[PDB]
Design brief:
PDB class: transcription regulator
CATH architecture of chain A: Orthogonal Bundle
Largest sheet of chain A: none
Helix content of chain A: over 70%
Keywords: Structural Genomics, PSI-Biology, Protein Structure Initiative, Midwest Center for Structural Genomics, mcsg, Alpha-beta-fold, TetR-fold, transcription regulator
Radius of gyration of chain A: 19 Å
Oligomer: homodimer
Number of domains of chain A: 1
CATH class of chain A: Mainly Alpha
Structural class of chain A: mainly alpha
Number of helices of chain A: 10
Assembly: dimeric
Chains A, B: Probable Dihydroxyacetone Kinase Regulator DHSK_reg
Strand content of chain A: under 5%
Entry title: Crystal Structure of Probable Dihydroxyacetone Kinase Regulator DHSK_reg from Listeria monocytogenes EGD-e
CATH superfamily of chain A: Tetracycline Repressor, domain 2
Largest interface: A-B, 23 and 23 residues
Order of helices and strands of chain A: HHHHHHHHHH
Number of strands of chain A: 0
Chain lengths: 188, 188
C-alpha cells in the first residue's frame, strides 16, 4: 500500500529534510529532487503532500514549534511561551536565516497573522466595555502585527545578535504600547 | 561606440520595460531575454547596468516617482508629497501588485528604510532637547517603519481598495502615534 508514504509522519519528515538542506544549501538553490533525495522518497510522494517548495516552506513555518507554542498563548503563559518560541527559532538558526533571507515575506505574513489574532483575542479579555470600536481594534492589531514581524525578521536577518529574552521584551513593549495607543485616541 | 547603450537613458528604459511586462506577465515568469526583447536591447547591455532582475527591480523601486518624491519630504510638503507618492504607486497598480505579490520583502525593505530615516530626521526637528535617547529613537523609528510598510504592502496586495487619501491619513496616524509613544515611555 501507500499508507506510510501518505502519512503525517512522512509529511513531517519532508519538512525535516528541507530544514536539513538549508544548513548546507541556499533555499533558492534547493530543488524538489534534493528534498526527496535527502528524505529517501520519490517525487510522486512529495507532490502528494505539497504543491511546491514554497507550500512546503509555508507548512514548515505553520507546523514549527514556534507556531505550535504560539497558538496556545494566554496572558498567564505569555512571558514563558514567547521566550520559548524565540529560543526555538534560534535553535533552528540556519534554517530560518536561510529561508528568511531568500523571501522574508512568507514568514512575515505567517507571524503577522498570528500576532494580529493574538492582539484581537487580547482586546476581548480587556475591553468587555467595547470602548474601542472594531475599526480601531483592527487598525491597532495590524500595527502591532507589523511591529512584531519587523522585530522578528530583523533579529533573524541580522544573525540572532540580541538575546532571546531581549527580543521577548521588545515584543511585549509593542503590546504594552499598542494597548496604550488603542486607549488614548482622543488624547488632544 | 557604446555611449547610448551605457547611458542612464537606456537604464531607465530597462526599468520601463520591466514595468510594461508586469502588465501581461507574472514577475516570477519574466526573464532577462523578455526584458531585452521588449526594450530592443541585447543581453550584454542588460548586464552592464544590472546583475539580475532583482537588482533591476530594487533599482526600479528606488528610482520610482514615489521614492524621488519621498526623499524631498519636509513637514511643510508632507501632506502633499505622501498623497502624491501613493497616487503614483496606484497609477502603476499592475506593476506594483505584480512584483509585491511575487516578493513583498523587496518593496517592504525599501519603504522601511525610507520611513525609518524620515522619522529619525523628524526627531531632530522636534527634539532639540534630546529628551529621547538614541536607543528609543531607533526603536520607535523602526516601529513606525514597520507600520508604514505593513500598511503599504497590504494596500497594494489587496488591490488598492481604499482611497489614496485614506492610506495617507493612516500613515500620518502612525506618525502621530509613534511620536506620542516616544514621548510617553514613563507613563506609569
Amino acid at each position: 500500500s501507500n499508507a506510510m508514504a501518505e502519512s503525517l509522519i512522512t509529511k513531517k519528515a519532508i519538512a525535516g529534510g528541507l530544514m536539513e538542506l538549508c544548513q548546507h544549501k541556499r533555499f533558492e538553490k534547493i530543488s524538489i529532487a534534493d528534498i526527496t533525495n535527502i528524505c529517501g522518497l520519490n517525487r510522486q510522494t512529495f507532490y502528494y503532500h505539497f504543491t511546491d517548495k514554497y507550500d512546503l516552506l509555508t507548512w514548515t513555518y505553520e507546523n514549527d514549534f514556534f507556531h505550535c507554542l504560539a497558538d496556545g498563548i494566554t496572558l498567564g503563559n505569555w512571558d514563558k511561551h514567547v521566550l520559548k518560541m524565540l529560543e526555538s527559532i534560534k535553535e533552528n538558526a540556519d534554517f530560518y536565516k536561510n529561508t528568511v533571507s531568500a523571501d522574508a515575506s512568507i514568514l512575515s505574513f505567517c507571524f503577522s497573522k498570528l500576532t494580529n489574532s493574538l492582539f484581537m483575542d487580547l482586546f476581548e479579555k480587556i475591553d468587555t466595555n467595547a470602548t474601542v470600536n472594531e475599526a480601531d481594534r483592527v487598525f491597532y492589531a495590524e500595527f502591532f502585527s507589523y511591529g512584531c514581524s519587523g522585530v522578528l525578521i530583523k533579529w533573524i536577518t541580522r544573525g540572532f545578535k540580541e538575546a532571546p529574552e531581549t527580543i521577548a521584551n521588545q515584543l511585549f513593549r509593542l503590546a504594552k504600547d499598542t494597548e496604550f495607543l488603542a486607549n488614548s485616541m482622543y488624547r488632544e
